Amino acid sequence: EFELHTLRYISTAMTDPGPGQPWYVDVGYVDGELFTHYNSTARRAVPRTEWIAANTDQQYWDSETQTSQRTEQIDRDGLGTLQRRYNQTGGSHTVQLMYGCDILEDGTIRGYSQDAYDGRDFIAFDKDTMTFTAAVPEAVPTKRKWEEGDYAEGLKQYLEETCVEWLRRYVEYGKAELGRRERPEVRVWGKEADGILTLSCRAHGFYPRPIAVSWLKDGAVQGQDAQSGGIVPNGDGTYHTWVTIDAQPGDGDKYQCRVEHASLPQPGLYSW
């Protein structure tokens, strides 16, 4: 992974949340870990990690709350504005915002801010040229709006300075958690089931996210009929992944799951 640290804020506005569900939700991640949350019901920006709560005061959260309530306001109008521009009424629609900064592996800094309507690219900031990139004709009026005045200047300033400044603080605040390594606990299972042996390898509770899980046959990497579920989250911030492979019944002994992860000094080999 090229990126060393990341700060990402996202938000969602919807016309059809579901019954009793908040129509607006915003959250923030540091190095992929959820550290703050707000929604249109609670109406409060709140801490989601101990290390953030331990290093912030009430005025900090009042400011985040104020910012979130403003973003909610903007989105409340937004849903209408964009429906109008797409000549739509009622139905299920969404507005999504995603922005933040990345500190890569040699000191390089990245900054982004992009929006989507009904889960499709709508518009994205191009801080290099200080313009906004319209994905569709319906975004042109927004582009025009945003390129007026000093809005673009402020957004660039936030992404390149403010965002980074705070990312480095957060990374400092929670380095004990964020910089830790949790060992995976692995299970290999087999199911005999239909003239086909299906072997399964599961790595439970590893951290950080990056991991490499492979099936070996007779010592050699394999390849065919391997299926992976990718990396999925646990409730506690650690991660989970499962890989399966189809084999011929009785060949169980020939297979090994191989796990490569930062927490392990040497790749782990697991048999059924």
Binding site: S68, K145, W146, W166
Partner: peptide, 8 residues
């Protein structure tokens, strides 16, 4: 910290 963007 979050950053306020503006109206669509």
């Amino acid at each position: 910290r979050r950053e306020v963007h503006t109206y669509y």
